[PDB]
Amino acid sequence: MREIVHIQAGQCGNQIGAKFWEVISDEHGIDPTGTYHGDSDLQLDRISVYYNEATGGKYVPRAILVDLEPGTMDSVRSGPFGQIFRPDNFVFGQSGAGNNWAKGHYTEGAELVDSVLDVVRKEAESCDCLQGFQLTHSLGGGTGSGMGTLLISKIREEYPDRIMNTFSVVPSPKVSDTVVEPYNATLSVHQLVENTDETYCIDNEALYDICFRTLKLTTPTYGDLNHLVSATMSGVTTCLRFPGQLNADLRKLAVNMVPFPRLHFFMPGFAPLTSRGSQQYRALTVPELTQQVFDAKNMMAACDPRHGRYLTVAAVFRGRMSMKEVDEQMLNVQNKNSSYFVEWIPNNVKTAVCDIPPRGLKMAVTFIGNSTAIQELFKRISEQFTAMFRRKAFLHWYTGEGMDEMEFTEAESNMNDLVSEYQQYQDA
Amino acid sequence: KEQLFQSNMERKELHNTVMDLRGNIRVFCRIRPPLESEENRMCCTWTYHDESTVELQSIDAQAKSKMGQQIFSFDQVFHPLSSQSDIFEMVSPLIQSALDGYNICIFAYGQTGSGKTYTMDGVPESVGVIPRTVDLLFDSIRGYRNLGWEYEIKATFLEIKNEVLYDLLSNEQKDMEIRMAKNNKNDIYVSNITEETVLDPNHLRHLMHTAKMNRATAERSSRSHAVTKLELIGRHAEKQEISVGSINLVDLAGSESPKTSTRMTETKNINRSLSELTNVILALLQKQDHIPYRNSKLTHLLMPSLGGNSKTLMFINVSPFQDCFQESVKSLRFAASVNSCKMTKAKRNRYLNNS
Amino acid sequence: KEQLFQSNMERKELHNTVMDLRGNIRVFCRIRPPLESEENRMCCTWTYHDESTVELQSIDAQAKSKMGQQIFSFDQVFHPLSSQSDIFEMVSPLIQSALDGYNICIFAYGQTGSGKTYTMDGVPESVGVIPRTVDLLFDSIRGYRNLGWEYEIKATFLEIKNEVLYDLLSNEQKDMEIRMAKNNKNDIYVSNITEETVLDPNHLRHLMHTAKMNRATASTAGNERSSRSHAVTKLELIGRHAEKQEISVGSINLVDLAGSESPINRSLSELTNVILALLQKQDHIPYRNSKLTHLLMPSLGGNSKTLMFINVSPFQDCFQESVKSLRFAASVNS
Amino acid sequence: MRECISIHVGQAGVQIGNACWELYCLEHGIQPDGQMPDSFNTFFSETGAGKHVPRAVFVDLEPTVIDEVRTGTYRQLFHPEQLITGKEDAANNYARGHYTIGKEIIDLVLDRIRKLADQCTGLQGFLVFHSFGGGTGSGFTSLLMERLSVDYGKKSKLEFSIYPAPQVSTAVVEPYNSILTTHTTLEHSDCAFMVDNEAIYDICRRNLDIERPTYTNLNRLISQIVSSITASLRFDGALNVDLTEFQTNLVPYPRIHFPLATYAPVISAEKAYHEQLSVAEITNACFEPANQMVKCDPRHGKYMACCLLYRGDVVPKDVNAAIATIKTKRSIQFVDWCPTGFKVGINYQPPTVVPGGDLAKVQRAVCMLSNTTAIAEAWARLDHKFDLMYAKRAFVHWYVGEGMEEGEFSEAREDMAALEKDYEEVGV
């Protein structure tokens, strides 16, 4: 039943996936053990797209956990909702790519690839129908980036039909955490845009500020950030996994949001961003929600829409809402943000109301916009690239592992091409 | 009468010279002799206004009401009674230019049963463009050996299918990638290609025979793209000069619509090729600043042929029957649009080895 | 007969269209072979890249590495082995265009002794552009006679030295002014000039001999008058077809430019600026800033075809001016 | 027994059919089981047991809607044989529903419908419910309509689709689906009815006076429309006119076959007391330019046909007087050779509103199937939208990659242009 396969890569990838499966289990009333104990039969019924039933109500999440450092999966085992997985899935190495993409693609990853590929394709054949692949990963480290690239290459070479969907965590413009993360991201996204069809730009400082001010948080732990990502991803597919008055799926988001093959990089968005106790200073309702969802204050990247145009938007409106008000609101935001809006492509909106709301929250929406503002992010990434490239800054680590600058030059050329496409369609 | 014959021969040679030196692509519309089975099934009417203009009136009732005088003037139009020599006569100067040190690409646009393999391969009966081109190339090679030019021929065979590159020469499954050379950004090569050095025309004939046997082993021929790259290097010891040229023999897949008798993925790749080619040629006609050359493998492989320093040929193989009149007229429209196209000026490359 | 020349008329109309689409303005370079009196002259290292590109190199290794790149591309390159027929092969289409009613400019550019006079006038042993042009023009008129067309040739000889025009067909010195034509503001005419009617090649040969004799050339006799004067030969074509009218008028401007070497350059610099502005599609062209450019109003328009030859001496002492001439040519090719 | 059948495809089709069949079971006193605790024999096959199975088949490529109707109250109403279900939606592609996945269930549904036809004694026609801009509602329906015309041709293929709205556009690729299905529907449709969304919004706003209606109300109005359409078959009236006369009565020309619906009274329960419900006043109300279901100005298009359907204790004398008075109106316009186009479907079977619905119990109700040149402008604007989207060949890769070509795109466009030429030449 149009099932979906779930992939893990990097520490960030594994953690965000962990909280994501906790969120989904909350959605469908699933105990940490694996036995169903919710009251809504409807969730349990359609649970096959995620939780493949094994025996007696114990549902194994369709999860593949890939890493080269056993610590992350050790934490998952120790952590709750880790034992719920079928332990055969924890397919990991021992050495570690050491935040080195070449190591993540030709060293230990290059041998763990088959030992994870067997399990993933056995799970795929165990499922009835398949839709795509969600590489829940990060571009921060080299591991979850290099092996992720190799794995998507393999999946594309074996499955041409499916619609993969990587939730890449784009490096922060300012709060840089890795000395050579620009090289890692550039090399990864080269092969991605070579094969992939949907990525995302999530900035750690973006969520840091969002929780600092919008959420009134003082300790932006990675718990908060990866909780937001989980809610976002969950909303991406609640259309498929749940009934609705006007239902959508991954296919809709795949074939509507891409006017062109390459131009397939995305920006998510979610509402409502209520703070801890802000239920009084405003009254919760869908108009104020739609107002506070499209602003640059409630984006996900550092790519300010004040320098880009929303090529397409795919608001989902998970919950119960009125089409009339959202039509009026999109018309009005078209009127006001026309400057930051593709004049060449009109009537760009994808209201796909899905009936079921999230737990304990009456109204919800997931913004998905193809803002022509990522090119600034790619320009800063390529500038970091060339600045580190004039002196080949700490290039010995990559070159020593049988790798040549030809690929770096090509990846930089292709990112310049991506910036050219973004600007060429933003101005035109 | 001898002066009249000399004037006629020189006029024909000058016409060949101007039409080959003509910029961009020498769009040629060839109508093969109609098959008797399809003739009695259904056929339409065609009239040749001249040797380079064709008009498929088809004198229909509804099709005529939609499409009447379909007269398109090209560089050369071939009658159904035209022989193989009639189509190799103007390709001979093309091969001369290729051996001069120019990159050359040859295309054959047509549907199933058009006669594309009759153009290049030539069908088991008679010969095609490929063997006569090889013979002319070797004759010019010996002539330039008498002129002191030592030339080497390098052959690489590639087949493009459903985004997966297949080596026609090697049956082993290999991951093929096409990349620009390190020496120059314009020339683009393919990695891990089965590349051999031609020793004699007999070896080339045997290689062609085994390649075509694999191709037949690989109705896929009706709807598959194969790319032949013949790279030539000519060294002159006395002059210490190297002349480099390439020949690109490319047979496009069937241009027929999906209809009913067609599989999904092959149709999809055919659509990729045709749609991307149409988009890039219309952008070139629109003098667009950027041509999205890196969307499909077909245009990216032939960057020198399409966006570099090369001269390209169009062979418009069209079935003259009415049952395929829509596709025939659409192909004629594409041929007219690409005849209106322009290409970068041809540049001869001379490499002096003084250093 | 009638169909033959009708097809010829269509072919020449299409040839004019082709020439207009190509760009009309074409630059060629010709190198004079060394003579018997210059065998002890230091030459230059001429590396022939193609038939459209050539690079000149100084023998002196001290300056060879201090000049960088000296490569220049043209439309066609003529080596010393090239005969006058090869040069004239690129002029006959322009002669046809003149027959068709278009204005043609033929220019020879270079330093003193480069061969501009040899390129244009030539020698009795090997005739230049002018005699071959005259012969082809008369043969074309004989052909046009078959289609009612009546062509009459009006030749005017004048010389420009110091922004003052002198008539070479008469010793009666007068004051001549270049004024706009009566029936065309764009077309130009010069008063008081002797406009003879050409009947046969012998008549025009006598006219050009008389003009040369009255010119009092001193290019090598003091390097005062001929070496710093422009020899402008103008051939007017008046095509007249009977029973149909629709007449056509063309002009052939054979100009032998003065020396481009450093010391009048007043006309040459203005001609260079005008040519560059035409290549740049400039809205306003400084035509009236020099007598030579003022005379060539109708022959430097959009439909007019301009031809230039860059003659360079293959000698080391002529390197400093050859590089300037090739830089002028590169200002055209790029 | 003038027995006819209906098919329902796509979310619009299935929900509209659900409404239609709930209303029929209510008007006939039919329980959800399928018995009445003759007239209804035209749509309900009577089993050996005390059960009347509807002569309808719900088919969709996506199992969600058919699944929900199986979970609806009317599973026992439907014989589970008819509920033909696919696996994945048509991804909003005419290409899919007409070339890729259709050729795999069309045989099954054709066997189903031929089984029903051989079950039927006297076959009348077909009632297909679907969308126009929806993927399956264009592809799959064009495939079925041509296939049935091949099968019968003589039967009354009554297409009852949804015309996409001018301003509000839920999907993004509607121009493609519309132009393609019309390219493949015009040559084989007896007559296709047209319904718009903005008009139903305006009606429920200013006439029903409801601020927040769901699709259930839109479908309720559609259901009342079809019930009034078919009451002549289902019941005896003073003048009964059936579907067979409709082909000749409505269209003046073979190809001009796109009438638009209109219902009256459209007032809520409050105005029932404020109105004494005369036949003349509703006769005027159905003709007013803000009461039609299609966003056009009927004052700006010459009418070619106005089929008026009535129900309840209505005498033809006052109806004749009222239509004569409306004929004397100045704003109303007609063509020359049809100066007497007023054919009435008077009937003396009162309509009944569903319990818990919106409309009140009205002694009389009238529906008019207006067909006028006013919809030519709507056709022109949709063709313009398609032409501008196709100008830059945006999105076209999907359709070409599921069995489509631009040649017949332009052929369909010129077919639309010829349709407009026919419209203007009928207008004069």
Ligand SMILES: Nc1nc2c(ncn2[C@@H]2O[C@H](COP(=O)(O)OP(=O)(O)OP(=O)(O)O)[C@@H](O)[C@H]2O)c(=O)[nH]1
């Ligand atoms: N009036 C009304 N319209 C609906 C309803 N459901 C869907 N639609 C319309 O259907 C259009 C899209 O076509 P769908 O029926 O939803 O999709 P489909 O025909 O199944 O094919 P897909 O586009 O692949 O899902 C939308 O613009 C909706 O407005 C409904 O319940 N009532």
Ligand SMILES: Nc1nc2c(ncn2[C@@H]2O[C@H](COP(=O)(O)OP(=O)(O)O)[C@@H](O)[C@H]2O)c(=O)[nH]1
């Ligand atoms: N959303 C989210 N991102 C994280 C979290 N922890 C780390 N990150 C980001 O993800 C990247 C992780 O690098 P990673 O690929 O896992 O390192 P590697 O596996 O050793 O190669 C870092 O650059 C962080 O920016 C988290 O808990 N949530």
Ligand SMILES: Nc1ncnc2c1ncn2[C@@H]1O[C@H](COP(=O)(O)OP(=O)(O)O)[C@@H](O)[C@H]1O
């Ligand atoms: N000039 C010609 N003379 C004889 N037969 C021809 C000619 N052109 C095409 N044909 C026939 O058309 C058929 C097409 O076969 P082939 O060329 O392999 O496929 P395609 O035309 O699709 O490339 C051949 O079997 C050949 O007999």
Ligand SMILES: Nc1ncnc2c1ncn2[C@@H]1O[C@H](COP(=O)(O)OP(=O)(O)O)[C@@H](O)[C@H]1O
């Ligand atoms: N190819 C040649 N062979 C022999 N003599 C030549 C050749 N070219 C020029 N001359 C000599 O040069 C003289 C012509 O001078 P020239 O160089 O044409 O003057 P200018 O410098 O004005 O062009 C003639 O007297 C002739 O003897």
Ligand code: ALF
């Ligand atoms: F039939 Al042929 F290619 F078109 F093999």
Ligand SMILES: [Mg+2]
């Ligand atoms: Mg073939």
Ligand SMILES: [Mg+2]
């Ligand atoms: Mg002299």
